[PDB]
RNA sequence: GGACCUACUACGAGCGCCAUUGCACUCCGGCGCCACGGGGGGUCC
RNA sequence: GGACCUACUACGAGCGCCAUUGCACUCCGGCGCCACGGGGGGUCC
């Protein structure tokens, strides 16, 4: 599987939720674990419903993976992983996450 | 017990719109919510009301999200003194 | 190789009694789902091992992601997926109780 | 609590767990951050679902708060703080 | 001190239910169920 | 209808400081900073 990283990869998110309400509600949940740099969210409505929360230090992401795993967020328990290396940066320039 | 839970110790620095939408993001798992009243008034601020359809939902919600760090601040959930507008 | 409901843990602190261990493992892996059994090796040659059997594969996969290399009794444990029936074969043989 | 201390104050602990199984599971988790002096646990009504982990050096406690904050321990995420005031065993080192 | 019985007893354990989110280091919340321990009473070595 | 302004206005918004832990279901604590939008008054094509 994937080594630790300061950014966590979230999937199984409710696609029906607008990007603005989502990115801001994700910050509402993960602001406890540390300083969030950016939060990238899947662009299209059809998209599986994914997001990236980029922390300043890996400690926050490591805690986030353990504590918020499977948390029912918008009636859907979100499935947290560690982000593959630089996938957060690659996903932004490719412009699939905003 | 009561059908609506009283939440306080909320981060006042967050706008009313972001708050109601983030609260619904958290408590939608426990049942059907009718309304969520939020106000930045001087007495009513830092607090919120979550109106559930059935009391069983509120008991699990109060049980589950007590002390939940919501915007770096663990929230204080209670039961409402009186009932809600709904009968 | 492929996913399984059971995770294979090794590099466990051998100085800890098996009784305290099984209970402390349940304290850590009960979060990822419903656990069926927790098998710990009693053997002399194969020392420092365990099996955590979850009801659903989702549980085992999440445990692998979250607790990989976690220092458990000041010793970071090394998690894998169980090799198929390897869990029951070690139980139908008494190397794990 | 903002002020660091040798002792971390843990709450939101699974109250149904026996005192012996608890301290042994807490030691199983916090022995990584340094040397633990004692782990005080009480199942009484006032101290129920709480714990104290007293470290030798504050660096141990700070690393512990940093790493295990919000960690789901017995299907319950624990909320770690710093202790209000030095533990009694600590205050016998620093003469208080 | 042991082993086997009991129209006895819930003091501990151990089960559940309710309440408690509480900063300690001078035990100690509340019920209910259950004699596994103990405690009585009894047949023996 | 456009553009280039204002010795005007903080009506919306958006920033910080202070005070605030408060039980409601019509409703707005207090200064400061800022004309992004607006609103006036203008000079032109």
Curated annotation (Swiss-Prot), chain B:
Span of domain RRM: 3-82
Effect of residue 8 to V: Abolishes RNA binding
PTM annotation (N6-acetyllysine): residues: 53
Record's subcellular location: Nucleus
Impact noted for substituting residue 4 to V: Abolishes RNA binding
Superkingdom to which the source organism belongs: Eukaryota
Family: Belongs to the RRM U1 A/B'' family.
Task performed by this protein: Component of the spliceosomal U1 snRNP, which is essential for recognition of the pre-mRNA 5' splice-site and the subsequent assembly of the spliceosome. U1 snRNP is the first snRNP to interact with pre-mRNA. This interaction is required for the subsequent binding of U2 snRNP and the U4/U6/U5 tri-snRNP. SNRPA binds stem loop II of U1 snRNA. In a snRNP-free form (SF-A) may be involved in coupled pre-mRNA splicing and polyadenylation process. May bind preferentially to the 5'-UGCAC-3' motif on RNAs.
Subunit structure as annotated in this protein's UniProt entry: U1 snRNP is composed of the 7 core Sm proteins SNRPB, SNRPD1, SNRPD2, SNRPD3, SNRPE, SNRPF and SNRPG that assemble in a heptameric protein ring on the Sm site of the small nuclear RNA to form the core snRNP, and at least three U1 snRNP-specific proteins SNRNP70/U1-70K, SNRPA/U1-A and SNRPC/U1-C. Interacts with SFPQ; component of a snRNP-free complex with SFPQ. Interacts with IVNS1ABP (via BACK domain); the interaction is indirect.
Record protein name field: U1 small nuclear ribonucleoprotein A
UniProtKB/Swiss-Prot annotation, chain D:
Keyword Acetylation: yes
MF annotations from Gene Ontology: DNA binding; identical protein binding; RNA binding; U1 snRNA binding; U1 snRNP binding
Biological role stated in the UniProt entry: Component of the spliceosomal U1 snRNP, which is essential for recognition of the pre-mRNA 5' splice-site and the subsequent assembly of the spliceosome. U1 snRNP is the first snRNP to interact with pre-mRNA. This interaction is required for the subsequent binding of U2 snRNP and the U4/U6/U5 tri-snRNP. SNRPA binds stem loop II of U1 snRNA. In a snRNP-free form (SF-A) may be involved in coupled pre-mRNA splicing and polyadenylation process. May bind preferentially to the 5'-UGCAC-3' motif on RNAs.
Effect of residue 48 to Q: Abolishes RNA binding
Domain RRM, chain residue ranges per copy: 6-85
GO biological process, one term: mRNA splicing, via spliceosome
Subcellular location: Nucleus
Protein species of origin: Homo sapiens
Alphabetically ordered keywords of this record: Acetylation, Methylation, mRNA processing, mRNA splicing, Nucleus, Phosphoprotein, Repeat, Ribonucleoprotein, RNA-binding, Spliceosome
Residues with N6-acetyllysine modification: 56
Annotated phenotype, changing residue 12 to V: Substantially reduces RNA binding
Cellular-component GO terms for this entry: nucleoplasm; nucleus; spliceosomal complex; U1 snRNP; U4/U6 x U5 tri-snRNP complex
Quaternary state and interactors: U1 snRNP is composed of the 7 core Sm proteins SNRPB, SNRPD1, SNRPD2, SNRPD3, SNRPE, SNRPF and SNRPG that assemble in a heptameric protein ring on the Sm site of the small nuclear RNA to form the core snRNP, and at least three U1 snRNP-specific proteins SNRNP70/U1-70K, SNRPA/U1-A and SNRPC/U1-C. Interacts with SFPQ; component of a snRNP-free complex with SFPQ. Interacts with IVNS1ABP (via BACK domain); the interaction is indirect.
Lineage: Eukaryota, Metazoa, Chordata, Craniata, Vertebrata
Gene giving rise to this polypeptide: SNRPA
Family per similarity comment: Belongs to the RRM U1 A/B'' family.
Record carries keyword Membrane: no
Protein name: U1 small nuclear ribonucleoprotein A
């Amino acid at each position: 599987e994937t080594r630790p990283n300061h950014t966590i990869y979230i999937n199984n998110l409710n696609e029906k939720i607008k990007k603005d309400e989502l990115k801001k509600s994700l910050y509402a949940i993960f602001s406890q674990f540390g300083q969030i740099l950016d939060i990238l969210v899947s662009r299209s409505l059809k998209m599986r419903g994914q997001a990236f929360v980029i922390f300043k230090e890996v400690s926050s992401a490591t805690n986030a993976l353990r504590s918020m795993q499977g948390f029912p967020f918008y009636d859907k328990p979100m499935r947290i992983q560690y982000a593959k290396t630089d996938s957060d940066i690659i996903a932004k320039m490719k412009g699939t996450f905003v």
